[PDB]
Symmetry: none
Subunit: 30 residues, 3 copies
């Protein structure tokens, strides 16, 4: 009979970069 | 003969953080 | 005799997008 199944493959690669953060806080009072 | 390939490996790591966000709005008048 | 093991499996899928980036810098003084 054919042999046993092979090992699970290697982990997938790291995903793509996440989204930008949101805008920063308002600037100082004038 | 050889057995079948193993299954796909685990999912990869989450991707890296996204970039810093854009500048915030102006502060208001003095 | 039984056949040898099958080969290692294929790469896993890429992981998900990473986390959002940090909040942006403060806006301009008002």
């Amino acid at each position: 009979p054919p042999g046993p199944p092979g090992p699970p493959g290697p982990p997938g690669p790291p995903g793509p970069p996440g989204p930008p953060g949101p805008p920063g806080p308002p600037g100082p009072p004038g």
